[PDB]
Amino acid sequence: SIRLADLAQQLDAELHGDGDIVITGVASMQSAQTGHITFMVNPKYREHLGLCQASAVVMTQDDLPFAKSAALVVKNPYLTYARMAQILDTTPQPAQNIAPSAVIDATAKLGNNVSIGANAVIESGVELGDNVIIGAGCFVGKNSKIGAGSRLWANVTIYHEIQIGQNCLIQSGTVVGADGFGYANDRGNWVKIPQIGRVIIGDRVEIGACTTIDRGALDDTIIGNGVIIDNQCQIAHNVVIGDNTAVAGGVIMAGSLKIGRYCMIGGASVINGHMEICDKVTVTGMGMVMRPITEPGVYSSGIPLQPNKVWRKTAALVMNIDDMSKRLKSLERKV
Amino acid sequence: GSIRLADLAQQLDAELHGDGDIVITGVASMQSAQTGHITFMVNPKYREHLGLCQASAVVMTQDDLPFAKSAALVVKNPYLTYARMAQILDTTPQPAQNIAPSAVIDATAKLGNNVSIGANAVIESGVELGDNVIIGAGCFVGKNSKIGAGSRLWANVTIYHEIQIGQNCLIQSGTVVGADGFGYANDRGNWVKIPQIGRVIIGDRVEIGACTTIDRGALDDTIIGNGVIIDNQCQIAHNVVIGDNTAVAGGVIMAGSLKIGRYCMIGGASVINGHMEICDKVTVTGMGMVMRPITEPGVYSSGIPLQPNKVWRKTAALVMNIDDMSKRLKSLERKVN
Amino acid sequence: GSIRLADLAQQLDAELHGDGDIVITGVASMQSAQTGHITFMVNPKYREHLGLCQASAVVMTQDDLPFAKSAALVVKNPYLTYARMAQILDTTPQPAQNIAPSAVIDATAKLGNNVSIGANAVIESGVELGDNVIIGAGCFVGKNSKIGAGSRLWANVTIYHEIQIGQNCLIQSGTVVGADGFGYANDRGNWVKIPQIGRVIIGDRVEIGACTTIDRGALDDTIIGNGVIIDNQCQIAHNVVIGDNTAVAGGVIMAGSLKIGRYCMIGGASVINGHMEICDKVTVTGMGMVMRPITEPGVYSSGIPLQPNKVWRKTAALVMNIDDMSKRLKSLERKVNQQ
Numbered sequence A: 001s002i003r004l005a006d007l008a009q010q011l012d013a014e015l016h017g018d019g020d021i022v023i024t025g026v027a028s029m030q031s032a033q034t035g036h037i038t039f040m041v042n043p044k045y046r047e048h049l050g051l052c053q054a055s056a057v058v059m060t061q062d063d064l065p066f067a068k069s070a071a072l073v074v075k076n077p078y079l080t081y082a083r084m085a086q087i088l089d090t091t092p093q094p095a096q097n098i099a100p101s102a103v104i105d106a107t108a109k110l111g112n113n114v115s116i117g118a119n120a121v122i123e124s125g126v127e128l129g130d131n132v133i134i135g136a137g138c139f140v141g142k143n144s145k146i147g148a149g150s151r152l153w154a155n156v157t158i159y160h161e162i163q164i165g166q167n168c169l170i171q172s173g174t175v176v177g178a179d180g181f182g183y184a185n186d187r188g189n190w191v192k193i194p195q196i197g198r199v200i201i202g203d204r205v206e207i208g209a210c211t212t213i214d215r216g217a218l219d220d221t222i223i224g225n226g227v228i229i230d231n232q233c234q235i236a237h238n239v240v241i242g243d244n245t246a247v248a249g250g251v252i253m254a255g256s257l258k259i260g261r262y263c264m265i266g267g268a269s270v271i272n273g274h275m276e277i278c279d280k281v282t283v284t285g286m287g288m289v290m291r292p293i294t295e296p297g298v299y300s301s302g303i304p305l306q307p308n309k310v311w312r313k314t315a316a317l318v319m320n321i322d323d324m325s326k327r328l329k330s331l332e333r334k335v
Numbered sequence B: 001g002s003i004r005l006a007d008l009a010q011q012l013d014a015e016l017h018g019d020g021d022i023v024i025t026g027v028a029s030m031q032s033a034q035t036g037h038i039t040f041m042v043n044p045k046y047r048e049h050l051g052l053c054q055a056s057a058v059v060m061t062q063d064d065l066p067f068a069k070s071a072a073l074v075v076k077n078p079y080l081t082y083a084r085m086a087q088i089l090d091t092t093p094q095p096a097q098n099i100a101p102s103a104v105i106d107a108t109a110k111l112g113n114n115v116s117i118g119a120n121a122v123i124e125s126g127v128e129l130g131d132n133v134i135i136g137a138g139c140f141v142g143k144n145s146k147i148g149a150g151s152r153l154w155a156n157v158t159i160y161h162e163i164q165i166g167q168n169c170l171i172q173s174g175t176v177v178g179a180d181g182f183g184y185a186n187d188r189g190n191w192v193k194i195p196q197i198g199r200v201i202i203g204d205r206v207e208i209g210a211c212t213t214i215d216r217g218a219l220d221d222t223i224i225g226n227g228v229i230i231d232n233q234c235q236i237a238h239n240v241v242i243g244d245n246t247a248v249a250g251g252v253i254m255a256g257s258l259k260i261g262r263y264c265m266i267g268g269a270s271v272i273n274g275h276m277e278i279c280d281k282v283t284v285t286g287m288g289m290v291m292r293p294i295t296e297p298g299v300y301s302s303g304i305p306l307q308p309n310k311v312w313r314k315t316a317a318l319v320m321n322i323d324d325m326s327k328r329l330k331s332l333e334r335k336v337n
Numbered sequence C: 001g002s003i004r005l006a007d008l009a010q011q012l013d014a015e016l017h018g019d020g021d022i023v024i025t026g027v028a029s030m031q032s033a034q035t036g037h038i039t040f041m042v043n044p045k046y047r048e049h050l051g052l053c054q055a056s057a058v059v060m061t062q063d064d065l066p067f068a069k070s071a072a073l074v075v076k077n078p079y080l081t082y083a084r085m086a087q088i089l090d091t092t093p094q095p096a097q098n099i100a101p102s103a104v105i106d107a108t109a110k111l112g113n114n115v116s117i118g119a120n121a122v123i124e125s126g127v128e129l130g131d132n133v134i135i136g137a138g139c140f141v142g143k144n145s146k147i148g149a150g151s152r153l154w155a156n157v158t159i160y161h162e163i164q165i166g167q168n169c170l171i172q173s174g175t176v177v178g179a180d181g182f183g184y185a186n187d188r189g190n191w192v193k194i195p196q197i198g199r200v201i202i203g204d205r206v207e208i209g210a211c212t213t214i215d216r217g218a219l220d221d222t223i224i225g226n227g228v229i230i231d232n233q234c235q236i237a238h239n240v241v242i243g244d245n246t247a248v249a250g251g252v253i254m255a256g257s258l259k260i261g262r263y264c265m266i267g268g269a270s271v272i273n274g275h276m277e278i279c280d281k282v283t284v285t286g287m288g289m290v291m292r293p294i295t296e297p298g299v300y301s302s303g304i305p306l307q308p309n310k311v312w313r314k315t316a317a318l319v320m321n322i323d324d325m326s327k328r329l330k331s332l333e334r335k336v337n338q339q
Ligand SMILES: CC1(C)CC(=O)c2c(nc3nn(-c4ccccc4)c(O)c3c2-c2cccs2)C1
Pocket: B229, B247, B248, B249, B250, B251, B265, B266, B267, B268, B269, B283, B284, B285, B286, B287, C182, C183, C184, C185, C253, C254, C255, C256, C271, C272, C273
């Protein structure tokens, strides 16, 4: 809980109202009650602010005349919302103290204020930085290094020789450093190629749940600083992702793909390998990415939903589009 | 556990034709069934094949009865009766029995009667487990989460904090309920985390497959209705609401703030956009690309299916250049008219 | 792990040119290789670059040998020899060593010789682990399941009950084998669970990636043939049958009762529908949308690739209206036919 005037100061917001109001948490505009702060981005909500029951509303200067409560004026309410949700965050930590049921190899090095959850398993040679938190049931493999401030939720798997920077956060079920999908072929029999490269994750990387990031075959899989990756993603061996790129849920990447900085990869996209995507590329959802992308901008693919009756005809005609093309050529000749 | 055929038929509300004292030990497919097994016939083309079936009894309809070559249970719906009798004769073990000495259970957790918790499970402070709840080995149940009577988690399931799960649910291994939604604000190209302080509310009789992820809401909640079934490796993003009795097949990826109505059927590998609504009684066939809201019930589909690669190369190129085809068609229409 | 270059060459059936007494400590890429490393060349474009490589030895072909600037191992297939030498020099640790005091192992479990079980792994009643089996930290292996000699599970792998795994398999973390298939009857809109009392049968020399799921069968079994390789994030539904040596790339989804033949190659993120068969020696390129049986070998593809968004918007609109384009074409043909 925090006085509104204090909160406004920390947010660098211009306060219009009673600064002694006590704010206990953040809430949606439709749910907010006394003690909650909320925010608005869409002008459509101006007319019904009299129905919002928040103690304070974050808004812009143009919104201020419509205010029906204490207001914090800022240029970017959504960004301010993020900041104030961090100030008022209620999320617990994955662990506190070192659990006696954890199994920690005698050669592991733990920094100051490290917490390790129940039944977590820490291999030989691991290095955990100051303030690192390892959730219950995690596995951290041999010689892996996790930088200060980083946190794993429960049941995360880190393989061996992995490097993770500072202030990262990895959600449960995720696996970092599994073997890449590397095989030679001897008369139809697959021959495993040991995957002896690593994964290097930079600082401030956030990874969702049940996501897999494979180790490289010889050199490394690299996740740059500030990257955010959603749930259910596959990042194959020797992928390289530039700083601040965002990868939405269910994206599948093939090996040796290089993605630049400030990219936005839409959910359920499929990105083929041994190719590069330059900085500042957006791929919209379900994109089928087969070719290098050399110019910034927004790219898309796919034929979207239709009523089944209509789709049946759409699909048949597209599958026979070569015949259509020939009929059009023939008609052009006759004319 | 074995059961007399008469007693089985009574529990199934079936008409017995044959020896009620036959002892049934389990369910089997028509081709695999041996003595002691009960099986079922849904396809009348097998009527002539019943003499080759070595089951001790066969579930069938009244129209099938003259074709029986064994004890028969006559029902209106052999498939539904199959489901019921497989439940009665289920050999599936429980995820755990009793409370394992290797489980780590906070002193403030509230355990109901007949709760079982498997080896090395971890139960946080304030957790409430209702009567007959079973937690598999290696599970994690985060702070203050509540699991209703009769619900069961297989091994290695992760439940985060402040999650609510109703009664008689079943969650398969690897599933994660309540991870942070994918919430970030952008500040001059840098991502700023938005804490996800909503929850997940899961209703009664919900079944969730393996390695599915259901993220907690940003402020308000992610909600799964009663009787919902969700297959493996789905992503249900923050603030999705799924209406009662909807089915979601495997590998479906949903964006945030999608609302799905009751009695929908979402085919495997579909992709669904967010901040929009799908009404009740919508079916999306497999791999559906659902970009826009669906306001009318019925069946919807997308996608161009497989062709020989040589063919596909031309199909793809011609489609990508379809605007040129369109212009040539218009130009030819003007030339002819 | 260090080995003399002459002995490595003998084990690789390679022709040594250079100092057999050189000590090789590991494999490295051509760009990263340093003293003590062996590397390989598959692209002759790098012949002029070999003077810049600091490896102690380079695997190459007879045609490459005159361009060597180091000890050389001459072989017919440098890529295959790389795979073999990376195995000889593998630095990958084992998932576990010996039996961890924190593992919870049912008294009725049967262990072969030289079995290792990692910390906090849980082994149910009736489980059988063959010789040299390694169970990683935190795994679960359910009742009566059998894991054959030489097979290894990384950490946090889940095996359900009555599962059979062959010899020399490798399963990466987060994978779940034997969960319930998606089986339900329907009583007036209410789903009625069908217990899934079939199993999963996995053959010998199967490799499975991370966070992959393979459901048990409803009555009959889900079957994975010998020598199959399966990538991360795959979904193999109940009663799927996969033939020997087939390869499944990452993110593939297979629906129930699909039968795939031998020596198939399924590209990443493909979607294969069920109750149908794919014959031997079929390749489905990535993101393939497989709706019908495939009865002939060869390569099959689907999908319209990426375009600039503004271009895609027009493409999609025209395709969605392609039936009107068809009707206009037929109408125009009729006019040119003078009818
Ligand atoms: C719940 C039920 C008893 C009935 C049902 O409707 C259904 C079931 N299993 C499915 N598997 N796949 C699938 C899985 C992976 C890839 C491709 C397809 C579907 O699409 C499935 C569907 C549906 C079909 C159309 C809408 S939902 C079993």
